[PDB]
Structure 1
Amino acid sequence: GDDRELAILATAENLLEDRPLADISVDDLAKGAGISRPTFYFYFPSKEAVLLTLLDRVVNQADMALQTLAENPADTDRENMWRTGINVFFETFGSHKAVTRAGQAARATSVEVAELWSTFMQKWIAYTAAVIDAERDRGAAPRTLPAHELATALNLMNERTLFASFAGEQPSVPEARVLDTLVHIWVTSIYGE
């Protein structure tokens, strides 16, 4: 039950590593999961719903990892506080590149995939702006741009730049340099007058 479902999810994650969702058939996922095609349609309405579920799991893993950090302050300077938080996203999506890639590609065709990405980006932006404001209240950061606008651009930058690096797009920051690049731009833009 729960286990035929996980088999179909693990198969789809596996196959997405080698080819696009468009090149993967329901029969492929059924055969990989060791079930028939009509049995597959019992657990999922379509191969699109499988990707939605995979994406939902990755996004909620990032989200829960960030909540965990937010509840327990790492004991360290501000540059490292940001680095640790951006790193949740670098490690989480970077450990699931195929789902991240197919999930981003599906934004163009799936309203539920577009709304999932949008809900969670709104959450992460609101958290980012809340930390910047806490920093300006403390007198640790200057009052420059509106915190929510700054947070929005920084989060969009990370979405686009992490994604280019994970894809090895041309152009992209190499994956082994992208964290340091992003933390530099977040710290100078949040703390710089």
Structure 2
Amino acid sequence: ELAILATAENLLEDRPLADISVDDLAKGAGISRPTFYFYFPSKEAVLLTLLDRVVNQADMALQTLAEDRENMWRTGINVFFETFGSHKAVTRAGQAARATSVEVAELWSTFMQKWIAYTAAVIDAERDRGAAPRTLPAHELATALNLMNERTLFASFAGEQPSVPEARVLDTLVHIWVTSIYGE
């Protein structure tokens, strides 16, 4: 199973999921094709599992943090920059699969809701302690900022035109987060 997952992530670096066959996956894993079907129903199920592992790893890293204001936010944004930036091929294939796969769509949406709720809870705590002003509803502010990070990180990692260069994206997002949370 782990060899099929590593193989899939390796090939995804080079080509889209549409250009990878079960045969390629089976072969890279040192197993036959019907032996593949024993571990996964499809190549789409492989990507789902890869995406699930990356998002959970980001989510666990953020839990570890939960357990200087600008540096506080930078470190939390950085969990996502590093975790997804270390898995760009999976990130990119997984984002494209939100369009065609309900399971990938639901997976992404469920974790965005969780990460928005955590951001909102931290902004509310900051407001409760007098460190942040009561401007926008916290949960709405958190939603826009998180959607910004999703779109901006993924555009930078994919080398999209337009995008912020990967080496400038963390400072760019942290500035927008800190000014909008503390400003006002």
Indicate the TM-score class for this superposition, using the shorter chain for normalisation.
over 0.9
**CA deviation string 1:32-66 (max 9, x = no partner):** 00000000000001000000000000000000000
Percentage of matched positions with identical amino acids: 100
Residues 87-112 of structure 1, C-alpha deviations (whole Å, 9 max, x = no match): 00000000000000000000001000
C-alpha distance in 2 between matches for 1:31 and 1:84: 40
- Is 1:47 aligned with 2:38? no
1:97-143 deviation per Cα after TM superposition (whole angstroms, max 9, x unaligned) = 00000000000010000000000000000000000000000000000
CA distance in 2, matches of 1:22, 1:119: 25
Q: Distance in 2 between matches of 1:137 and 1:10?
A: 45
CA offset at residue 166 of structure 1? 0.4
Quote the offset at 1:68 in angstroms. 0.3
Runs of 4+ in structure 1 over 2 Å off:
none
How far did residue 82 of structure 1 move? 0.1
Spell out the pairing of 1:19-168 with structure 2 (5 A cutoff): 19-71=15-67, 77-168=68-159
Residue 82 of structure 2: SS of its match in structure 1? Answer: helix
TM (norm. structure 2) is: 1.00
TM-score calculated relative to the size of structure 1? 0.95
Instruction: Tell me which residue corresponds to 1:74.
Output: none
CA–CA distance in structure 1, aligned partners of residues 53 and 128 of structure 2:
35
Tell me how far 1:145 sits from its aligned partner: 0.2
User: What CA RMSD, in Å, does the superposition of the two structures yield over aligned residues?
Assistant: 0.3
Residue ranges of structure 1 left out of the alignment (5+ in a row):
72-76
Q: How many residues align?
A: 184
Unaligned runs of 5+ in 2: none
Separation of aligned partners in 2, 1:21 and 1:162: 21
